[PDB]
Swiss-Prot record:
It is a single-pass type II membrane protein. Changing residue 174 to S: In allele Bw08. An alpha-L-fucosyl-(1->2)-beta-D-galactosyl derivative binds at residues 172, 184, 242, 265. This is Histo-blood group ABO system transferase. The chain holds residues 64 to 345 of 354 of the full protein. Mn(2+) binds at residues 150, 152. Residues 3-284 are lumenal. Glycans are attached at residue 52. UDP-N-acetyl-alpha-D-galactosamine binds at residues 60-62, 65, 150-152. The conserved DXD motif is involved in cofactor binding. The manganese ion interacts with the beta-phosphate group of UDP and may also have a role in catalysis. Changing residue 169 to R: In group B transferase; lower-level protein expression and intracellular cytoplasmic mislocation. The gene is ABO. Changing residue 242 to A: Almost complete loss of specific activity in group B transferase.
Amino acid sequence: FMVSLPRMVYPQPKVLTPCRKDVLVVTPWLAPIVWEGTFNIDILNEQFRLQNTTIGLTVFAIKKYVAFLKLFLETAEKHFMVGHRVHYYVFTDQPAAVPRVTLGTGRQLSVLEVRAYKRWQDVSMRRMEMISDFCERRFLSEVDYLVCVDVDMEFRDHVGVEILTPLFGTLHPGFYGSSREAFTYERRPQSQAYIPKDEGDFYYMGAFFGGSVQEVQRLTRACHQAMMVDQANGIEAVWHDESHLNKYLLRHKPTKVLSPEYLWDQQLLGWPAVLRKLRFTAVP
């Protein structure tokens, strides 16, 4: 049950003026594409706080990548869901190497040790398997939404409840202006991740997806199962779990799509006019 919003004073939305005219802000299946200027964060914060929303953030930091945790977590504290309840789940092979990061009130961190796996096949499948096969009951009990991101990143600007929805993917920064035939989908019909040249909405990046716990578990389960089939058939998708994520999101449309504000590499791609903010960026 959702209680009434309080009285709020904010600028009136005007029907005969778009928020953005330079970009697509809704997909053909009526999912918002989230760009700066499309949302009033005050309204959204109210809506999500009134539900006492808890967001889980999963991040894998394996081998040398543990070195990225400090900046990842410190910047998440500055920019990720501030004001809301947040539970970080750090999956790592080196629990002792996790930095001691000071957290704001209402935010917690759990260190989850993984796992075994001395063959690259299981490593490739590790993340999808971990989210769907091992942490299933815990996530359902502890958080409302799950967000799955890469560690070799930093937050530079607001990443907040505007992204929350049953299921979201993020436009890959390298390909948002590309035609579908150019997308690096898996193109071999022998792979479960196969997408023909005449199919595809967007190319989504494996580095930032999420949704409700239930929808994320469905996605990660399906991707893990598809990857197991490929392994049995002696094939590895061109971009690993990202290829499978793309197949899943073609066949199960996301209910929001994040713009490349949410996943950017400034060293590689600069700062285009279409990006008013660079929110979450690759570490050079």
